[PDB]
Amino acid sequence: KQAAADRRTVEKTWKLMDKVVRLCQNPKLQLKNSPPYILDILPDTYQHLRLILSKYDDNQKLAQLSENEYFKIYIDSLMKKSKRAIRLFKEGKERMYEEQSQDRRNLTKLSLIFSHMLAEIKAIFPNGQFQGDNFRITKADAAEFWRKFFGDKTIVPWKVFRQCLHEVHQISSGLEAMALKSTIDLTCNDYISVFEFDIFTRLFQPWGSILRNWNFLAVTHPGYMAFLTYDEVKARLQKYSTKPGSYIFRLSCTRLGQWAIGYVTGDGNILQTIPHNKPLFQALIDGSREGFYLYPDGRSYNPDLTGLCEKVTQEQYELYCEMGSTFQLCKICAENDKDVKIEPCGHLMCTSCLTAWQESDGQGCPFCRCEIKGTEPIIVDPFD
Numbered sequence: 030k031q032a033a034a035d036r037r038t039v040e041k042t043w044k045l046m047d048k049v050v051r052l053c054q055n056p057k058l059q060l061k062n063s064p065p066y067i068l069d070i071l072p073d074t075y076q077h078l079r080l081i082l083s084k085y086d087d088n089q090k091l092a093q094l095s096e097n098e099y100f101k102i103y104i105d106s107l108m109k110k111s112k113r114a115i116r117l118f119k120e121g122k123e124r125m126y127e128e129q130s131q132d133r134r135n136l137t138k139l140s141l142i143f144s145h146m147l148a149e150i151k152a153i154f155p156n157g158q159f160q161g162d163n164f165r166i167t168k169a170d171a172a173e174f175w176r177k178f179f180g181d182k183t184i185v186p187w188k189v190f191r192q193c194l195h196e197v198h199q200i201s202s203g204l205e206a207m208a209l210k211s212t213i214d215l216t217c218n219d220y221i222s223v224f225e226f227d228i229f230t231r232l233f234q235p236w237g238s239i240l241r242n243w244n245f246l247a248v249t250h251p252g253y254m255a256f257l258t259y260d261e262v263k264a265r266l267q268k269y270s271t272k273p274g275s276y277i278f279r280l281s282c283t284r285l286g287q288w289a290i291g292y293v294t295g296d297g298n299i300l301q302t303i304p305h306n307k308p309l310f311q312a313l314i315d316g317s318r319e320g321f322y323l324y325p326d327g328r329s330y331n332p333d334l335t336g337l338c339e340k341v342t343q344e345q346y347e348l349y350c351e352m353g354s355t356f357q358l359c360k361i362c363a364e365n366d367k368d369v370k371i372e373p374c375g376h377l378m379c380t381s382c383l384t385a386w387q388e389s390d391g392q393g394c395p396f397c398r399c400e401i402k403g404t405e406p407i408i409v410d411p412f413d
């Protein structure tokens with residue numbers, strides 16, 4: 030539950046965003062101007078929040094805006110991530126100036142969240158006017174799923190989304206569900222907006238086999254690079270410039286819902302292409318037969334993708350989860366946050382799963398099976 034996103038609350042987020050900008054302006058960080066660039070994103074977020082306030086110019090319009098379900102969640106998430114960025118700089122101390130530290134890695138995670146949130150707020154409020162109830166999901170079969178389970182909702186909790194998705198496309202485990210949350214919930218707010226659903230369904234289309242497409246194209250494919258920048262894609266492929274057909278594919282933080290395939294040409298140049306509103310695996314199979322996409326990340330083995338026209342280990346899901354912000358969520362259910370600590374092993378989970386486990390005569394801790402000497406309520410942050 031969130032409080033009303035009134036003018037006073039919207040302004041509190043501006044002051045927090047301002048603090049983050051000054052922290053990130055420190056030249057000891059040697060911050061790359063490559064996307065997501067927090068120094069462009071936060072002022073652009075402020076300008077969009079002003080554009081929204083200029084459209085709702087009277088007290089009655091402001092009251093309607095303050096009680097908008099999506100707007101309340103958005104302002105609360107914006108406040109939370111800004112406070113989190115301030116805390117990261119405080120606790121990080123000198124580790125913020127170490128490009129390879131976990132504190133800096135967390136800053137990249139926040140920068141990506143702020144980037145995704147800006148694209149989301151511009152899609153839901155184009156020109157500062159709410160259009161969430163009129164948001165058009167690109168894929169019709171995916172739009173019918175959203176309309177069936179969520180009606181005209183602009184945003185739904187992750188918990189409800191995952192349960193309803195499972196009715197159509199089965200999710201085989203807690204780790205898979207955790208990996209799926211980090212892929213769809215781009216803003217890391219424990220909700221799925223109709224815009225995040227549109228991005229995910231555009232990337233892993235067709236809808237009919239979306240989870241097989243996601244598992245084969247992203248979780249386990251050696252060519253998949255997530256939001257690795259164009260410069261890093263070219264520098265990664267530079268090592269294989271003597272192997273024509275070496276290719277990698279990435280997501281674009283400035284072009285959400287689109288893929289960018291970098292590859293080595295016959296003359297050793299590294300070129301890129303953005304496939305149309307077509308399935309990524311189709312472009313990859315087309316490119317394989319034509320001779321452009323043969324070696325995913327220079328690897329001589331190109332996985333056979335032709336099965337998607339008509340398995341993943343727990344370890345594979347665990348590795349995939351590292352780039353995300355899912356540490357705060359119970360690993361057993363992947364729907365409730367961790368709120369309880371076992372003693373003396375220290376394993377964390379939600380109370381509901383611990384109760385289910387104790388009521389099943391499960392011996393000791395569900396993770397390690399050491400005797401549960403006691404429990405303690407806790408609050409976990411994704412960066413612990």
Ligand SMILES: C[C@@H](c1cnn(C)c1)n1cc(C(F)(F)F)cc(-c2cccc([C@]3(c4nncn4C)C[C@@H](C)C3)c2)c1=O
Pocket residue numbers: 134135136137138141211212213254255256257258280349350351352353354
């Ligand atoms: C810049 C880029 C990168 C860097 N090296 N590489 C190979 C990729 N990057 C870096 C981070 C970092 F942890 F902050 F460092 C985090 C992500 C990242 C953050 C959240 C979700 C994801 C997605 C994801 N993709 N694979 C796993 N996840 C979990 C791609 C989404 C649709 C889910 C990636 C990322 O993209």
Ligand code: NA
Pocket residue numbers: 213214215216217218219220221222225
């Ligand atoms: Na989200």
Ligand SMILES: [Zn+2]
Pocket residue numbers: 359360361362363364365378379380381382383
């Ligand atoms: Zn749980």
Ligand SMILES: [Zn+2]
Pocket residue numbers: 371374375376394395396397398399
């Ligand atoms: Zn344990």
